[PDB]
């Protein structure tokens, strides 16, 4: 069996994520704050997925639904539970040996409350404005605020080839509490944000 050695706390930028879904409606299109995508256990540089764990049980986190509906909405479809269930089954099960479902979602909520990206960039006016930003600059501002380098993830429009920031990753040690440096970015030196 495999033992995760770290976590990737992944937050997503709703507007960008929605823009890549040019086919249909997008519930979170109007959100202007980073929301939780998921907490992904890592192993030797790779995300551990689909581990032999417990079925998702909404009643196990019923007490967090309040916070989850605000910080962890399904931005693509109007079904938050489906999104939480998927993230648990695909990612959460892989760290269940230490964190049961209730503990994992609570961990994600706490991490989100301790990692306000927009708030951290505002003092530098480095927030979203649909213009080009520097990977180095953004990583620098976040490290100065939180203490460690985040991971920046981008997606490229197939038509225009323009790169857009879509997710920001905060890396944690196996304890799920000690912030550590992220080392992998999918974003190039510059991107739209
Ligand atoms: O707000 C969101 C963001 C992503 N996804 C979905 O989750 C998957 C991406 O997450 P992952 O499987 O890599 O954890 C995709 O199928 C995507 O449609 C949602 O349902 N809602």
- 90 known member of a binding site: yes
- 65 known member of a binding site: no
Q: Which two tokens stand for residue 89?
A: 């089954």
Contact 36, 11 (CB under 8 A): yes
Which residue's CA lies nearest to atom 17 of ligand 1? Answer: 76
Q: Domain residues of the chain, as ranges? A: 1-193
Atom of ligand 1 nearest to the CA of 38: 14
- 167 known member of a binding site: no
Instruction: State how far the alpha carbon of 152 is from the alpha carbons of 66, 102, 179, 185, in Å.
Output: 28, 28, 16, 5
In the reported structure, the alpha carbon of residue 83 is separated from the centroid of ligand 1 by a whole-number distance in angstroms of 7
3-state SS class at 88 = helix
Active site (annotated) includes residue 167? no
Closest CA to 53 of 111, 92, 87: 92
- The residue annotated as part of the active site, out of 3, 63, 91, 96, is 91
Active site (annotated) includes residue 91? yes
Q: Which resolution, in Å, applies to this structure?
A: 2.0
Atom of ligand 1 nearest to the CA of 37: 3
Contacts of 85 (CB under 8 A, 6+ apart): 56, 58
User: To test the ligand 1 pocket, which listed residue (18, 19, 37) has its Cβ within 8 A of the most ligand atoms?
Assistant: 37
Atom of ligand 1 nearest to the CA of 82: 20
Instruction: State how far the alpha carbon of 92 is from the alpha carbons of 18, 43, 47, 172, in Å.
Output: 24, 13, 11, 15
Which residue's CA lies nearest to atom 20 of ligand 1? Answer: 83
In the reported structure, the alpha carbon of residue 10 is separated from the centroid of ligand 1 by a whole-number distance in angstroms of 11
Bridge partners of residue 133, in order along the sequence: 191
State the structure-solving technique: X-ray
Q: What is the CATH number of domain 1-193?
A: 3.90.730.10
Q: What distance in Å separates the CA atoms of residue 185 and residue 167, rounded to the nearest whole number?
A: 10
In the reported structure, the alpha carbon of residue 77 is separated from the centroid of ligand 1 by a whole-number distance in angstroms of 10
Contact 77, 28 (CB under 8 A): no
Render the burial of 59-87: b for 16+ CB within 10 Å, e for the rest.
Answer: ebbeebbebbeebbbbbbeeebeebbbeb
């Amino acid at each position: 069996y495999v033992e995760f050695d770290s976590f990737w706390f992944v937050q997503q930028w709703p507007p960008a994520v929605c823009s890549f879904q040019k086919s249909g409606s997008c519930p979170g299109s109007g959100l202007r704050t980073f929301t939780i995508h998921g907490l992904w256990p890592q192993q030797s540089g790779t995300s551990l997925t689909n581990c032999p764990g417990s079925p998702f049980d909404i009643t196990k986190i019923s007490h967090l639904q309040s916070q989850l509906n605000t910080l962890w909405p399904n931005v693509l479809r109007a079904n938050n539970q489906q999104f939480w269930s998927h993230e648990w089954t695909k990612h959460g099960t892989c760290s269940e040996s230490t964190f049961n479902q209730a503990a994992a979602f609570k961990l994600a909520v706490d991490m989100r409350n301790n990692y306000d990206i927009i708030g951290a960039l505002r003092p530098h006016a480095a927030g979203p404005n649909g213009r080009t930003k520097s990977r180095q600059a953004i990583k620098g501002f976040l490290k100065a605020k939180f203490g460690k380098f985040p991971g920046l993830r981008c997606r490229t429009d197939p038509q225009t080839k323009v790169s857009y920031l879509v997710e920001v990753v905060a890396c944690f040690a196996q304890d799920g509490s000690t912030l550590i440096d992220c080392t992998r970015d999918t974003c190039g030196a510059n991107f739209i944000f």
